PDB file of C-alpha atoms and ligand atoms in Angstrom:
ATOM      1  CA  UNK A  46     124.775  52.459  50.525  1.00  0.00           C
ATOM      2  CA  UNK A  47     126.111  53.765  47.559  1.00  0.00           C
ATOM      3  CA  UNK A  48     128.631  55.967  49.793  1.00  0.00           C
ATOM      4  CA  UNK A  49     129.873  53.232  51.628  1.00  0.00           C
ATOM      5  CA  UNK A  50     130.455  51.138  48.384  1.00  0.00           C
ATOM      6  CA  UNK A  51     132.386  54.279  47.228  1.00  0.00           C
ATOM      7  CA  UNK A  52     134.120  53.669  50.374  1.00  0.00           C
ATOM      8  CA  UNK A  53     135.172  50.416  49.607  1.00  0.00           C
ATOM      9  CA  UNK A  54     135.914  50.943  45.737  1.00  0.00           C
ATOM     10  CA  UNK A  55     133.226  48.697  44.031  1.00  0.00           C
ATOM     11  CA  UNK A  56     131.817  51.835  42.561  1.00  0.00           C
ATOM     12  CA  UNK A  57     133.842  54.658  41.420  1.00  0.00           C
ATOM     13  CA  UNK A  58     132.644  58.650  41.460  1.00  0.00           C
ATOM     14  CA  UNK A  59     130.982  60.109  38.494  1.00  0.00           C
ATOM     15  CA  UNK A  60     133.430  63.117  38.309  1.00  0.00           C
ATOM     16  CA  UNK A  61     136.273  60.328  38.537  1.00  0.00           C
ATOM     17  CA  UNK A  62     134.432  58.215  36.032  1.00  0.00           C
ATOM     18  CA  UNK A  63     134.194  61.574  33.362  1.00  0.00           C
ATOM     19  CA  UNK A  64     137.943  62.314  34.000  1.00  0.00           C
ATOM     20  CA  UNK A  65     139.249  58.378  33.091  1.00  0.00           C
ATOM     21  CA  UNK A  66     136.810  58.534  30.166  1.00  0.00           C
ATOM     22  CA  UNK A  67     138.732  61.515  28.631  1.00  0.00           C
ATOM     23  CA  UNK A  68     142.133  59.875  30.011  1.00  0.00           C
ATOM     24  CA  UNK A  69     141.420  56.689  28.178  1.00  0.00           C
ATOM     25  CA  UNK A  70     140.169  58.236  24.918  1.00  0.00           C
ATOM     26  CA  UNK A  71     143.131  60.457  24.719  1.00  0.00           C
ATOM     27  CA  UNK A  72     145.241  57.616  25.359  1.00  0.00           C
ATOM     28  CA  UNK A  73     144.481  54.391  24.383  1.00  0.00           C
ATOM     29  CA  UNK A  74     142.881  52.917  20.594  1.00  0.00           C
ATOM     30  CA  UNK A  75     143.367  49.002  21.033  1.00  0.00           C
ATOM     31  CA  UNK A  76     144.194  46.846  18.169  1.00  0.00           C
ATOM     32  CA  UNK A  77     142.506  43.177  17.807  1.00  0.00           C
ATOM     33  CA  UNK A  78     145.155  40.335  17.175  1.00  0.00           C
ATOM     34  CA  UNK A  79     144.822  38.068  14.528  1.00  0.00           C
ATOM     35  CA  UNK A  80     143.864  35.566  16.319  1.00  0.00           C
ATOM     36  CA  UNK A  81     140.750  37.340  17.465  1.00  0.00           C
ATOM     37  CA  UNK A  82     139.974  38.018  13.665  1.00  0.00           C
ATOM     38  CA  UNK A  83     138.678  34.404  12.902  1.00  0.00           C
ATOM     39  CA  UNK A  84     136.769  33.874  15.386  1.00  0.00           C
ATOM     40  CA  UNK A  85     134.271  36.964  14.691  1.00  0.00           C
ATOM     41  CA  UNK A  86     134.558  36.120  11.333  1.00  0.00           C
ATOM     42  CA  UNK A  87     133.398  32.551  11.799  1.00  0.00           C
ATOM     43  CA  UNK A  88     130.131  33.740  14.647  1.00  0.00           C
ATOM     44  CA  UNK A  89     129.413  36.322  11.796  1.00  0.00           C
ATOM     45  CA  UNK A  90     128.845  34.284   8.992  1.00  0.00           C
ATOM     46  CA  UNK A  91     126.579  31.397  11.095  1.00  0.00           C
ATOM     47  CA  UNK A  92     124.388  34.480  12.017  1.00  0.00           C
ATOM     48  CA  UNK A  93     124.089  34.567   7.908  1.00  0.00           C
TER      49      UNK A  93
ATOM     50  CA  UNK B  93     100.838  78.099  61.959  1.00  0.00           C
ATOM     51  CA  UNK B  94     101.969  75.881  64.712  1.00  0.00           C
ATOM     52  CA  UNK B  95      98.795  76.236  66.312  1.00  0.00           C
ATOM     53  CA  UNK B  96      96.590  75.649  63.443  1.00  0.00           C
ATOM     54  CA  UNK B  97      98.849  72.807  62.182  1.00  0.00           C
ATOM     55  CA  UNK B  98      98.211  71.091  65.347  1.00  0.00           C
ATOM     56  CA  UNK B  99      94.536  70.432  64.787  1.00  0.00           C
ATOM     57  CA  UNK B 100      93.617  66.858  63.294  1.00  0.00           C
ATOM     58  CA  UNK B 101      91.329  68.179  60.102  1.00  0.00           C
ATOM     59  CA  UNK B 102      94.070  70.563  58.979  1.00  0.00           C
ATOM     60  CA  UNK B 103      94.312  68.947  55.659  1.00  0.00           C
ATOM     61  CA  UNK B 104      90.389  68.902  55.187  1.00  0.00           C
ATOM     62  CA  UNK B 105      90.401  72.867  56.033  1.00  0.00           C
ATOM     63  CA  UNK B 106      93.164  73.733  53.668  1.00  0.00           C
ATOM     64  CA  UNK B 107      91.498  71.578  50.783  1.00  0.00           C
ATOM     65  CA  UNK B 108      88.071  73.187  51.490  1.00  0.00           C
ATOM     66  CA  UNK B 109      89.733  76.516  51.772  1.00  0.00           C
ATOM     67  CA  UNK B 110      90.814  75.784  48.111  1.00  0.00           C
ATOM     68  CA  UNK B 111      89.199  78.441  45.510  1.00  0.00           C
ATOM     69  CA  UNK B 112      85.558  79.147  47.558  1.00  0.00           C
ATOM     70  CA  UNK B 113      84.131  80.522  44.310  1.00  0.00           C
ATOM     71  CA  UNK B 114      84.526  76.898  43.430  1.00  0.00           C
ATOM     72  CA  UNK B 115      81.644  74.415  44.736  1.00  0.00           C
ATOM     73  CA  UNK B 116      81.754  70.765  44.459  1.00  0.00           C
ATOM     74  CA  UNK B 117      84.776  70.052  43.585  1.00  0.00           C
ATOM     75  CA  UNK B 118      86.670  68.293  45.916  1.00  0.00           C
ATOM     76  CA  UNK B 119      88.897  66.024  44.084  1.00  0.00           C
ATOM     77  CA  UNK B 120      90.204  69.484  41.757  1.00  0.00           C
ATOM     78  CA  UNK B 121      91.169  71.326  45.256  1.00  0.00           C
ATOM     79  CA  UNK B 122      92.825  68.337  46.617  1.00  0.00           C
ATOM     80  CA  UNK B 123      95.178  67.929  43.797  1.00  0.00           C
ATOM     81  CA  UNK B 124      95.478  71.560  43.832  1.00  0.00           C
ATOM     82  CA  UNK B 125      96.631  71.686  47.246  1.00  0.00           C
ATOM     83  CA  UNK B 126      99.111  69.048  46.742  1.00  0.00           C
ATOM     84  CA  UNK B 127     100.387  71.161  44.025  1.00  0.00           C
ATOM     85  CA  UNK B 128     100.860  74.472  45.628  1.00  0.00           C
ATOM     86  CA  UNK B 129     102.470  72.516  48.784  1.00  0.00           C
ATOM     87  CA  UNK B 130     104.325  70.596  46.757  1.00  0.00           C
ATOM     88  CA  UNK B 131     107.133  68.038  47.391  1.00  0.00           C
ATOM     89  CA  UNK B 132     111.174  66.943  47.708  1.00  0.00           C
ATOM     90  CA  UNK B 133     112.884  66.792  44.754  1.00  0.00           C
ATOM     91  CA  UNK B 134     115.737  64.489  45.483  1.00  0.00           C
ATOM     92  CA  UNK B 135     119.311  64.401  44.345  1.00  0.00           C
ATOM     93  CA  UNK B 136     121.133  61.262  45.701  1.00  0.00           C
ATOM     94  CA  UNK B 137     124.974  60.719  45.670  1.00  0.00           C
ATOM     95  CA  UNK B 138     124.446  63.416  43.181  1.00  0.00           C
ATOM     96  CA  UNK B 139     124.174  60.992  39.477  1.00  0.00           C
ATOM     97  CA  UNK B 140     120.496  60.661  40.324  1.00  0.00           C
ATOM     98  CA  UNK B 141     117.857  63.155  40.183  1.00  0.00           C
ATOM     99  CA  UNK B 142     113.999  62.843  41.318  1.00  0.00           C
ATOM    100  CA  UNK B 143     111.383  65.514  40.599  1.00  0.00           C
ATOM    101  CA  UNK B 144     110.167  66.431  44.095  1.00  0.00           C
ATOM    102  CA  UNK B 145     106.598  68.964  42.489  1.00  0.00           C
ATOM    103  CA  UNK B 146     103.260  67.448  41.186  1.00  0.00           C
ATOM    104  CA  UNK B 147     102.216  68.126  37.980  1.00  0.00           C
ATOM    105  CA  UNK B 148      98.461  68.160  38.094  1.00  0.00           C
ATOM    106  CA  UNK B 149      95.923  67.981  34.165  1.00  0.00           C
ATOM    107  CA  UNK B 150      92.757  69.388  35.191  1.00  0.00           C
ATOM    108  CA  UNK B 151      90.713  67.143  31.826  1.00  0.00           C
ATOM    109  CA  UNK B 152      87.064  68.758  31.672  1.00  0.00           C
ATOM    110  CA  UNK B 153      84.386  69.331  29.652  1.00  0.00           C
ATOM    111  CA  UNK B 154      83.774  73.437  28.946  1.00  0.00           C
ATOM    112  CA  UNK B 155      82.044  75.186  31.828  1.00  0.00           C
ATOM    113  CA  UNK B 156      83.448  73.355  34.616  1.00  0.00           C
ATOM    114  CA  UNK B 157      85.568  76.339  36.171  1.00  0.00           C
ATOM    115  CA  UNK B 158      88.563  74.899  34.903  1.00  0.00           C
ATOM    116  CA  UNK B 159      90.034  78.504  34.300  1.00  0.00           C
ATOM    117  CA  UNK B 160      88.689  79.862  38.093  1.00  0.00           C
ATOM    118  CA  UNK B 161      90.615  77.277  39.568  1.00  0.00           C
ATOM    119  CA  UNK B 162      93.958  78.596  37.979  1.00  0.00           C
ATOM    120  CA  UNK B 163      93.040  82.472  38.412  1.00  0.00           C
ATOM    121  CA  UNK B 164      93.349  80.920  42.082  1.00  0.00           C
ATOM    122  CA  UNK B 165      96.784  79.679  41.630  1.00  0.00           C
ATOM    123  CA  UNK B 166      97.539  82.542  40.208  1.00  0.00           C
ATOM    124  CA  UNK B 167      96.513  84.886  43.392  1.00  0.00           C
ATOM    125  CA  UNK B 168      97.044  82.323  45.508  1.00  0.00           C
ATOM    126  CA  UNK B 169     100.883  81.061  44.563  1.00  0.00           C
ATOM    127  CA  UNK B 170     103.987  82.558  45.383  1.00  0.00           C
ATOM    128  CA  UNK B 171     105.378  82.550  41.630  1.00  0.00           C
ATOM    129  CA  UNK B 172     102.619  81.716  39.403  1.00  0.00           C
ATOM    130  CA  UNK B 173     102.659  82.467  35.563  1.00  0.00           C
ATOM    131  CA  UNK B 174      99.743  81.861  33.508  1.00  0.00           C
ATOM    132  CA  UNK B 175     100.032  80.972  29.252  1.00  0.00           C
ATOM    133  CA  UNK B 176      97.588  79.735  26.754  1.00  0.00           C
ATOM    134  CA  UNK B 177      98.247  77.882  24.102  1.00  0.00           C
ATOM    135  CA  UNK B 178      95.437  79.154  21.879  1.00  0.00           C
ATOM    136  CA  UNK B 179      95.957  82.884  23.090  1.00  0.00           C
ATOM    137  CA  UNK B 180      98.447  85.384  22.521  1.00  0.00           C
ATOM    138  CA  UNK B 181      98.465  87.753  25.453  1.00  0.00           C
ATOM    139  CA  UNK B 182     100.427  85.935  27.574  1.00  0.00           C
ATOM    140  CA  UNK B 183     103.794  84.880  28.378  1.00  0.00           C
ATOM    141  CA  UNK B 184     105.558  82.305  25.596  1.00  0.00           C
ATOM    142  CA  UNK B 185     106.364  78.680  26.895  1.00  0.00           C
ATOM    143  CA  UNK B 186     109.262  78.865  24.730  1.00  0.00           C
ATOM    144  CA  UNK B 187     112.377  80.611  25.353  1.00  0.00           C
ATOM    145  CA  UNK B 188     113.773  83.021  22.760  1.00  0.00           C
TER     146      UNK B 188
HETATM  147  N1  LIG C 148      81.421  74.346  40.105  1.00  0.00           N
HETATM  148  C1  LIG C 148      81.337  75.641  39.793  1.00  0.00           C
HETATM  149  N2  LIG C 148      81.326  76.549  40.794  1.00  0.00           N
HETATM  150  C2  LIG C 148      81.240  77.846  40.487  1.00  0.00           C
HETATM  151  N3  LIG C 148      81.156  78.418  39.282  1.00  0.00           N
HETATM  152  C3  LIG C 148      81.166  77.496  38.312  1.00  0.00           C
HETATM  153  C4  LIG C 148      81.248  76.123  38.472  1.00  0.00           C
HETATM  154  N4  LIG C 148      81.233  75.481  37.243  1.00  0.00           N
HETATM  155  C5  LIG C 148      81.144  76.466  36.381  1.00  0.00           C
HETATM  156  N5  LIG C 148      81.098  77.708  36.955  1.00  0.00           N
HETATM  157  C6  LIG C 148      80.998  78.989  36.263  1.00  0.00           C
HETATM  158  O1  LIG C 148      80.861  78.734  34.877  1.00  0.00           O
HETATM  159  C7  LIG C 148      81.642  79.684  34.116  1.00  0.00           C
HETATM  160  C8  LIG C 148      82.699  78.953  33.329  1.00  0.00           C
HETATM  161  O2  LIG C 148      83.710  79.906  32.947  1.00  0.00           O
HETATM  162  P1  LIG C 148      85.231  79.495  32.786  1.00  0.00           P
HETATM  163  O3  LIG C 148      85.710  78.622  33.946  1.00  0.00           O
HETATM  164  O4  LIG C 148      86.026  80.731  32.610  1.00  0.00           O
HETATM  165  O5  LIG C 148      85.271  78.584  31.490  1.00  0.00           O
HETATM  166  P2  LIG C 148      85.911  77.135  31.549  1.00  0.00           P
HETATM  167  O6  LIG C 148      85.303  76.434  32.763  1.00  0.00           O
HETATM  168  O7  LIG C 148      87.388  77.203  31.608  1.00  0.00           O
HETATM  169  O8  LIG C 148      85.449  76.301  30.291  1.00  0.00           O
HETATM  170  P3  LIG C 148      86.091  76.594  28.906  1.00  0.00           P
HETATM  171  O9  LIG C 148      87.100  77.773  29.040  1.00  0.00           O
HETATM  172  O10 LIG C 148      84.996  76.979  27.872  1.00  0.00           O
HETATM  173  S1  LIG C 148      87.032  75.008  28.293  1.00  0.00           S
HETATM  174  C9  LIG C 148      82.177  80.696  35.126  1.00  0.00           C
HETATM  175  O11 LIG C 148      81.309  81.817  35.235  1.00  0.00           O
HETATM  176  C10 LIG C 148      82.226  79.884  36.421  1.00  0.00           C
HETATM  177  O12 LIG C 148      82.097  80.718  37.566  1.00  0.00           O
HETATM  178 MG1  LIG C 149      88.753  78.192  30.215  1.00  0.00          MG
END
């Protein structure tokens, strides 16, 4: 089963999966907007 | 092999055939027998990994032939090396 979902792409090799981990580390560091700054702010402080 | 594997109380014959300077107990040679035969250890698709040997803990009270039963394994075994915990002529657990 889990070689015919490789097959069909809704699960991706562990080799393949160790390689795009370094490829994304190396490459991308995202930045959140501003927008997306109140918001946790705001469901931070009602946990409080 | 073939021809002795073919009978139907095989299993019974190998268990009593476990350790005959041990008497009465059964239930110790059984588990030892699954032991030394052993089972599959399984890798599927490769990311998962089952332990395919049985690890048996012979708990007893002192005088129960405990240490007979692994001199047994020992002779018996293909690769069998004994330690003690409390003893020091023996091979370390630990690597080094
Ligand atoms: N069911 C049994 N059949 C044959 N011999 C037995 C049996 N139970 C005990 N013995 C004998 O009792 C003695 C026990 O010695 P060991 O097995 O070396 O000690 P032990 O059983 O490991 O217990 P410890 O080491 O004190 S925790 C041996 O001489 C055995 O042969
Ligand atoms: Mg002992």
């Amino acid at each position: 089963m889990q070689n015919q979902q490789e097959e069909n792409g809704s699960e991706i090799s562990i080799e393949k999966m160790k390689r795009y981990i370094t490829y994304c580390r190396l490459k991308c560091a995202p930045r959140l907007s501003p927008q997306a700054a109140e918001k946790l702010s705001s469901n931070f402080v009602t946990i409080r | 092999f073939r021809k002795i594997s073919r009978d139907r109380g095989i299993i019974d014959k190998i268990i009593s055939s476990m350790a005959p300077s041990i008497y009465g107990h059964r239930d110790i040679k059984t588990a030892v027998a699954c032991s030394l035969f052993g089972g599959v250890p399984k890798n599927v698709n490769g990311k998962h990994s089952i332990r395919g040997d049985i690890n048996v803990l012979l708990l007893g009270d002192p005088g129960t032939a405990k240490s007979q039963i692994l001199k047994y394994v020992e002779k018996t075994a293909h690769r069998a090396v004994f330690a003690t915990g409390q003893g020091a002529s023996a091979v370390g657990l630990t690597a080094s």
